Amino acid sequence: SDRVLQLKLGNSAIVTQEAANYCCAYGEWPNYLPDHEAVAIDKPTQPETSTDRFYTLRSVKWESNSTGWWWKLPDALNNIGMFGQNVQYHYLYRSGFLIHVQCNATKFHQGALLVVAIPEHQRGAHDTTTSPGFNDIMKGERGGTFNHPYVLDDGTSIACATIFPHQWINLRTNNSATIVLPWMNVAPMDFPLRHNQWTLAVIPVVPLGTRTMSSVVPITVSIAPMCCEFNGLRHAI
């Protein structure tokens, strides 16, 4: 009942038969920008189904020595489908996100992944006073990897990361995690190419292990923008 779920947006749908309810970040739900909070005065474009749909990124392999993975939003999708086109042709964007992380194995496998959506995850660099560079931050669809997941690569800690919207994928329990993210920013809209509102982090707190037949165990991420709005139309960047 709270273990099965179907998500449908646009021409895309996803089902899971081993869910663990699902998370609504801070108890909120995505919505379009109301007139009393608006700033940009040009009429926005709300493409709906062409952008508010699931985009599945390339999978990653969960290995015995993996440290974890991360994908920044909207960066990870800024070059995918019609969402990517609207982002490139407009100075301003706004949207929520429906995140679905997938990972199945066997009744003989064990492992636990923390799936957390971090707002404003400003990364820190290790053992240097030099700030992270553009290429250390903007990885796009490929996403990045954690150097020191123990401190969330920002000098804090993964132990307290549960203060952020999250779920876990504990192999003996479930095979997917779902998190609904509302627009999260101090401004009603933003320039999509230089600021990432959220960072999706998937970290193996309990390593993958088994004594049965060894198989490649992938982790897949599907993300659907929600209530997309774009302002400041011009040429593509």
Binding site: F108, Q110, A112, W168, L171, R172
Partner: peptide
């Protein structure tokens, strides 16, 4: 406490 062993455990 969350047990993170396999289902068969």
């Amino acid at each position: 406490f969350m047990f993170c062993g396999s289902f068969m455990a």
